[PDB]
Amino acid sequence: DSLFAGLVGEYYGTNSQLNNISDFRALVDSKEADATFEAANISYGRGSSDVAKGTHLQEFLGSDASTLSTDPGDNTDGGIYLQGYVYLEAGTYNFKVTADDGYEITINGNPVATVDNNQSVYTVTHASFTISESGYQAIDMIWWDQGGDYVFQPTLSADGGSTYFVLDSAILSSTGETPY
Ligand SMILES: O[C@@H]1[C@@H](O)[C@@H](O)CO[C@H]1O
Ligand SMILES: [Ca+2]
Ligand SMILES: [Ca+2]
Ligand SMILES: [Ca+2]
Ligand SMILES: [Ca+2]
Ligand SMILES: [Ca+2]
Ligand SMILES: [Ca+2]
């Protein structure tokens, strides 16, 4: 398990339709990842013409694509599963996520941002949640594209929604140890 300032990323493609969270999670369960990568700057897309075709995944992942384990072949539909840790002080936070299609983010195993359906690009300000103890918190994310356009940018606020930040190498850890 390598130590890096990012989340462990897995990409999965399929030629079946992804309509909701359950469909993507079942894809993840069904096989080994089509590619792995380091998710160090979680602000992906936008692009067009299906994330799972050609080099669209590379374009979507941008600054993280150089860590891809392989170049997946074509599929119609696809998505990502990210997992690891995020340093957060105790306090109150909320996500604001821009996405096409849907997604789910969990912290310490509890959902904190959910869109359980397909959608063209849309930004949701999610409800707040609490962190009870400062440190590295467990975090995971799924996102998918059913086809067409694709974008995924979760941002996080620690100040009641006045300012938001991207999750990146400043605060992410793949294993929960401090990355240097
Ligand atoms: O990206 C597409 C968008 O272009 C629209 O067709 C609605 O579904 C989304 O998945
Ligand atoms: Ca799997
Ligand atoms: Ca490809
Ligand atoms: Ca980019
Ligand atoms: Ca859970
Ligand atoms: Ca589809
Ligand atoms: Ca789409």
Numbering used by the authors: 11 to 190
Text lifted from the article:
MpPA14 (Marinomonas primoryensis PA14 domain) lectin is a domain of a 1.5-MDa adhesin responsible for a symbiotic bacterium-diatom interaction in Antarctica. Bioinformatic analyses indicated the presence of an ∼20-kDa domain near the C terminus of MpIBP that is a member of the PA14 family, which is a carbohydrate-binding lectin module widely distributed across several kingdoms of life. PA14 domains share a β-sandwich fold and the presence of two consecutive aspartate residues in a cis peptide linkage (DcisD). The DcisD motif coordinates a Ca2+ ion that is directly involved in binding polar vicinal hydroxyl groups of various carbohydrates.
We further analyzed the crystal structures of MpPA14 in complex with three pentoses, l-arabinose, ribose, and 2-deoxy-ribose, as well as inositol, which has an unusual 6-carbon saccharide ring without an endocyclic oxygen. These four carbohydrates bound MpPA14 more weakly than glucose and mannose. Crystal structures showed that MpPA14 selects the pyranose form of pentoses for binding. As pentoses have a higher percentage of furanose present in the conformational equilibria than do hexoses, selectivity for the more thermodynamically stable pyranoses might contribute to the weaker affinity of pentoses toward the lectin. For instance, despite l-arabinose existing in solution predominantly in the pyranose form at 25°C (57% α-arabinopyranose versus 30.5% β-arabinopyranose), only the α-anomer complexes MpPA14 via its 1,2-diol. For instance, while arabinan is a polymer of arabinose, a sugar that MpPA14 binds, X-ray crystallography showed that MpPA14 is selective in only forming a complex with α-l-arabinopyranose. This conformer is not present in the arabinan polymer composed of 1,5-linked α-l-arabino-furanoses, which are then not free to transition to the pyranose form.
